[PDB]
Every structure is written in structure tokens, then in C-alpha cells.
Amino acid sequence: GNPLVYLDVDANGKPLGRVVLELKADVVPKTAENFRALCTGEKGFGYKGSTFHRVIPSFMCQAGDFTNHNGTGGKSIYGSRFPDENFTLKHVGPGVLSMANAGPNTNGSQFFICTIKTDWLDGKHVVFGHVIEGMDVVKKIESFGSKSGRTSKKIVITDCGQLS
Numbered sequence: 001g002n003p004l005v006y007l008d009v010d011a012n013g014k015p016l017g018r019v020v021l022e023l024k025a026d027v028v029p030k031t032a033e034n035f036r037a038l039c040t041g042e043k044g045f046g047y048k049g050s051t052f053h054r055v056i057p058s059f060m061c062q063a064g065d066f067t068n069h070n071g072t073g074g075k076s077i078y079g080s081r082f083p084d085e086n087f088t089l090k091h092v093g094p095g096v097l098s099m100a101n102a103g104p105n106t107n108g109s110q111f112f113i114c115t116i117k118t119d120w121l122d123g124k125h126v127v128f129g130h131v132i133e134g135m136d137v138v139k140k141i142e143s144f145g146s147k148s149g150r151t152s153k154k155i156v157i158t159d160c161g162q163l164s
């Protein structure tokens with residue numbers, strides 16, 4: 001069935017725990033496959049060691065820039081960018097997993113986890129999963145953000161991979 005992957009997150013070098021994500025390959029197979037392989041690191045690159053660089057309370061936690069480490073970069077397993085697969089899944093509430101972008105068809109590796117319903121992103125960002133477990137970790141991460149998105153703690157994905 002749909003892959004389960006994990007992110008183990010530190011904040012200032014102390015572990016916050018594990019966020020488990022279901023990737024909705026049944027709806028968005030290409031987008032799910034990208035995220036899955038970036039979690040495993042099996043192409044030679046991926047999320048391990050990268051940061052949550054932009055976190056805005058009552059909105060979302062954003063991460064996945066493992067090339068520039070600042071929110072300008074990242075890349076997919078297919079190349080630097082790939083198309084919007086579809087917008088079938090909606091930003092229905094907290095725990096929704098969705099691709100960051102710089103406009104249409106600029107998906108790379110950056111992603112975000114919503115902490116509220118972000119319905120205005122519907123049709124602009126590809127939703128491809130949700131938090132199965134570890135929403136408590138997502139709320140801790142959210143607590144270290146700011147209105148500008150600037151984090152008050154160093155939030156690092158120390159480990160990641162595929163559970164099934």
C-alpha cells in the first residue's frame with residue numbers, strides 16, 4: 001500500500017521524537033516516490049541532516065532544503081524540479097503534508113506540515129500525505145517558529161527513512 005516514512009527531529013541537539021508520514025502514492029505516486037526516496041537517501045542525497053528552516057505558528061512547519069540549507073534550494077530525485085502532479089488532495093487541517101514551491105511546477109524537496117487548515121493553498125501546492133503519528137513533535141516544532149518564519153531553535157531532521 002501507501003508508504004510510511006519517518007523523520008526523527010532534534011531541536012538544539014535534543015531529540016523531540018518521530019513524525020510518521022503516510023505518503024498518498026495512490027493519488028500522487030510521483031510526488032510520494034520522490035519524498036520516500038529522499039527519506040531513505042538511496043539516490044545519494046536526501047533529508048538526513050537538513051533543517052526545518054521556516055516555521056510560522058498557526059500555519060505550518062517547512063523543511064527539506066538539503067542543498068542550500070536556507071530555503072532557496074533542494075532538489076528532487078528526477079532533477080532540480082518536477083511538475084505539479086495534481087491538486088486532488090486538499091489542505092483540510094492540521095497534519096497535512098504538502099510540497100513547498102516557488103510557483104507552478106517547481107516542486108523540489110522542500111515540504112511543509114500544516115498546523116491549521118490552509119485552504120488558500122488548495123490548487124497551488126501539491127498535498128501528498130499526512131501525519132500518522134507525532135503531531136506532538138509537529139506542535140513542539142511550531143512552538144519554536146515566529147511570525148517571520150525564523151526559528152528560535154536549530155531544528156534538524158537527524159534521521160529519516162521508510163517504515164513500509
Ligand SMILES: CCOC(=O)CNC(=O)NCc1ccc(N)cc1
Nearest residue numbers: 071072100101102106107108109110
Ligand atoms: C506554505 C509553503 O510556503 C511556501 O512554499 C513558500 N515558498 C517558498 O518557501 N519557496 C522557496 C522554494 C524554493 C524551491 C522549492 N523547490 C520550493 C520552495
